[PDB]
């Protein structure tokens, strides 16, 4: 199952490379030609705009690696 973007804290996160997919439990970002799910973090995404404009945006959570 896919989504074009993730809505997180009011911002739309697009996949930097690859496609956002759901494996039945969690959302992961993976590459189009070979399934290998990655954790969706702020490194694997491109933020642009608000959540109102994208059709099909989903309420997932994007991980922040700087948290201690």
């Amino acid at each position: 199952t896919t989504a074009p973007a993730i809505c997180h804290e009011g911002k739309a996160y697009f996949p930097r490379e690859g496609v956002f997919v759901f494996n039945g439990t969690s959302w992961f970002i993976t590459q189009r030609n070979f399934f290998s799910p990655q954790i969706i973090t702020t490194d694997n995404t491109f933020v642009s705009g608000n959540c109102d404009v994208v059709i099909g945006i989903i309420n997932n959570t994007v991980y922040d690696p700087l948290q201690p």
Binding site: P4, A5, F14, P15, R32, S48, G49, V53, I55
Partner: peptide, 25 residues
């Protein structure tokens, strides 16, 4: 593949990020 998503792929193959397609779909 959802059609809009293959268009995003195609846009991103010409240097225009996918954001353009989804924001201006």
């Amino acid at each position: 593949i959802p059609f809009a998503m293959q268009m995003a792929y195609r846009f991103n193959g010409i240097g225009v990020t996918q954001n353009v397609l989804y924001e201006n779909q």
